[PDB]
Amino acid sequence: TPVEGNNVEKEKAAAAIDKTNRGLKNSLNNVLTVRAELGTQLSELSTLDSLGS
């Protein structure tokens, strides 16, 4: 969006970008939580199969 010299577009775009920044941060934390849960799943599976053998 062109913002050259045009206030109400300059800052408006800037606010959208800020909201995007926060959103990306939250998304990263969420996907990291999912990764952690899968890591526990894998560790359990490895431990369980040895028990089975």
Residue the block writes with tokens 């969420």: 30
Q: Does 7 bind another protein (CB under 8 A)?
A: no
Site for another protein in 8-47 (CB under 8 A): 18, 21-22
The residue (of 22 and 35) whose beta carbon lies closer to another protein is 22
DSSP 8-state symbol, 9: T
Query: What are the angstrom distances between the C-alpha of 18 and each of 34, 41, 50?
Result: 25, 36, 49
Smallest separation (angstroms) from another protein to the CB of 37:
19
- The binding site for another protein (CB under 8 A) comprises 18, 21-22
